[PDB]
Design a protein around this ligand. Structure first.
Ligand SMILES: CC(C)=CCC/C(C)=C/CC/C(C)=C/COP(=O)(O)O[C@@H]1O[C@H](CO)[C@@H](O)[C@@H]1F
Length: 599
């Protein structure tokens, strides 16, 4: 009836407007949020989907947000791509919320066919309130595209579940089924963890197909683009994984650390009350072969199990330094099936059954009310590596809303990098100076005579910056200046580095600067390198990089691309992925088998 359709529309409009206003009132783009940006700039300048010119390191786990922002930046005439990232994050996240609302509305629709009820926003409303969700709806991270994808997939899965009406014996439109399969396949691309959902989404559809031929067709059509881009990834990167995810070696069974992260995430907002209350409310509302998998209860179980598995995977992998970025997706999955709750009357009219309202609207008030307390409650990010990155970068730079990459220049070491680069025109390896905030320069190898004069527009050497914060360098340093990270976000040598101790999460595997100065035309002798580096480590690392395996891995990720290079990378992606380099230069030279040079 209109009395319920309009109520659903008003709930969707209200939540979308509130969430969009909350996003626009916190314009934040993380340092990682500028990594996507860096890559897409390299793509729009003709250098392909790469982080640095020649260094084919895939620092974007999204594979769709990267290209979505690429398209946005292409169409945009304003030189700032940060505005593209902001607009796309807002729009995609708002669309995700709207789509999940409408999917839940369709899920509850069959129950309200003969009974008129007022939908109300719950579960998803608290998600809007939850400050991490509001903060991360704006950054250049995937939490906008992830929300959009989850909303779309939820709506399509609900449509498929209710689609079981036997129009011509197929129980669902062929085109709609194929498109849903395609979306489920794209889950793998959108975010590697989402593959779980994308897996569990496909199987539920596969088991719903009668004949093996139909299952084969569904799995092929649904997973054609993801497999094609996996082949392209193998080729243009030589890695089975994006490259960041490879920066973690033997990372598992961090149950204690993951539990600590979950408790930290729950503490400033008290998510236990929403969880308990929404579980009780969903149960109270619920108290009204292939056929049993293609049912709305099956899809609800799908979304709940997908959220639980996402949370379990995140705990097993350990929540990153982000306050709540990792847990937003599983939490959104949990809240999706109860994203909009109908106040249907039992319609057995004596009052005893009417108590439902007094015990189901009231619960929603105890939900929405908590939401009004959840947003307003400050979100704290004491030895744990969990820090609210939005607050960190707002109080680290000179601005409270660090939207543009020109705003990030106020960061302590990010004006100094530019001053040094224009100060030294013969190249340099820039490292964070221990004495002062400015950069220690290991000057690049002096350019050879007659090559300085044989250069277009004056000779500029190879500038290589080595610093933990990566994206802000990408969008402030310049397109042609190599950008590298200690952890291995965009450093091919660091990503392969093996780890000895668990340490901290997201920042433990700090590669030695000796490795960083090992590669590139950078001077080695003690007088020119900074004092606080060890020359012996530098020489040992340089001797280590010449080993056949590491040298071959680097060549396959830096040599000029071609058909032969693409085929060889596809063939040897497995070999390159399962190749770990010991952190200590001396122990590597022992492992690789090359002799240790004398001091
Ligand atoms: C199949 C399943 C379910 C399990 C394995 C699948 C898998 C590979 C696991 C997850 C990989 C992982 C840790 C990704 C972390 O991404 P993140 O730290 O956000 O990336 C940085 O943030 C920016 C935008 O994301 C990027 O520019 C930066 F790189």
């Amino acid at each position: 009836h209109v009395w319920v359709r309009v109520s659903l529309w008003v709930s969707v409009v209200t939540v979308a407007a509130l969430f969009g206003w909350g996003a626009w009132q916190r314009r934040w783009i993380a340092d990682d949020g500028l990594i996507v940006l860096r890559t897409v700039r390299n793509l729009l300048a003709g250098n392909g989907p790469v982080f640095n010119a020649g260094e084919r390191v895939e620092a974007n786990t999204s594979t769709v947000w990267s290209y979505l922002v690429t398209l946005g930046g292409f169409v945009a005439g304003s030189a700032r791509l940060e505005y593209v990232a902001l607009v796309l994050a807002l729009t995609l996240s708002v669309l995700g919320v709207v789509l999940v609302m409408f999917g839940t509305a369709r899920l509850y629709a069959p129950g309200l066919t003969g009974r008129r009820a007022v939908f109300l926003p719950a579960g998803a409303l608290v998600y809007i309130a939850i400050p991490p969700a509001r903060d991360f709806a704006t950054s250049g991270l995937e939490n906008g595209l992830v929300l959009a994808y989850l909303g779309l997939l939820w709506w399509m899965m609900v449509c498929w579940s209710q689609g079981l009406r036997r129009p011509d014996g197929e129980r669902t439109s062929r085109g709609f089924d194929a498109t849903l399969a395609v979306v489920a396949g794209m889950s793998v691309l959108v975010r590697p963890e989402l593959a779980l959902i994308g897996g569990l989404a496909l199987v539920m559809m596969l088991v719903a197909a009668p004949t093996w031929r139909r299952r084969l067709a569904l799995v092929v059509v649904g997973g054609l683009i993801p497999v094609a881009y996996q082949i392209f990834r193998m080729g243009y990167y030589g890695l089975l994984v994006p490259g960041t995810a490879l920066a973690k070696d033997a990372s598992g069974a961090k149950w204690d650390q993951g539990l600590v992260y979950l408790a930290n995430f729950n503490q400033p907002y008290l998510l236990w009350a929403p969880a308990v209350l929404l579980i009780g409310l969903g149960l109270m509302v619920l108290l009204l072969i292939a056929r049993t998998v293609q049912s709305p209860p099956a899809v609800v179980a799908f979304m709940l199990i997908s959220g639980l598995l996402q949370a379990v995977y995140w705990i097993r992998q350990g929540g990153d330094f982000m306050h709540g970025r990792v847990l937003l997706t599983p939490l959104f999955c949990l809240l999706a099936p109860v994203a909009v709750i109908p106040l249907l009357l039992p319609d057995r009219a004596r009052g005893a059954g009417y108590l439902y309202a007094g015990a189901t609207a009231v619960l929603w008030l105890a939900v929405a009310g908590w939401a009004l307390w959840a947003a307003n409650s400050p979100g704290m990010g004491t030895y744990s590596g969990i820090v609210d990155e939005r607050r960190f970068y707002s109080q680290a730079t000179g601005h409270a809303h660090p939207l543009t990459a020109a705003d990030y220049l106020d960061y302590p070491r990010m004006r100094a990098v530019l001053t040094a680069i224009e100060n030294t025109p013969d190249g340099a390896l820039l490292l964070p100076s221990g004495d002062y905030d400015r950069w220690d320069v290991v000057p690049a190898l002096p350019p050879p005579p007659d090559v300085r004069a044989a250069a277009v527009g004056g000779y500029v050497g190879p500038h290589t910056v080595f610093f933990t914060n990566l994206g802000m360098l990408g969008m402030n340093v310049g397109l042609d200046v190599r950008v590298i990270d200690q952890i291995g976000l965009a450093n091919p040598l660091a990503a392969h580095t093996a780890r000895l101790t668990d340490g901290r999460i997201g920042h433990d595997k700090n590669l030695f600067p000796d490795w960083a100065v090992a590669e590139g035309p950078f001077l080695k002798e003690p007088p020119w390198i900074p004092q606080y580096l060890d020359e012996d480590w530098i020489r040992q690392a340089e001797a280590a990089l010449k080993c056949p395996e590491t040298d071959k891995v680097l060549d396959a990720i830096r040599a000029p691309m071609g058909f032969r290079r693409f085929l060889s990378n596809v063939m040897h992606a497995a070999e390159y992925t399962r190749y770990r380099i010991d952190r200590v230069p001396l122990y590597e030279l022992a492992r690789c088998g090359l002799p240790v040079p004398e001091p």
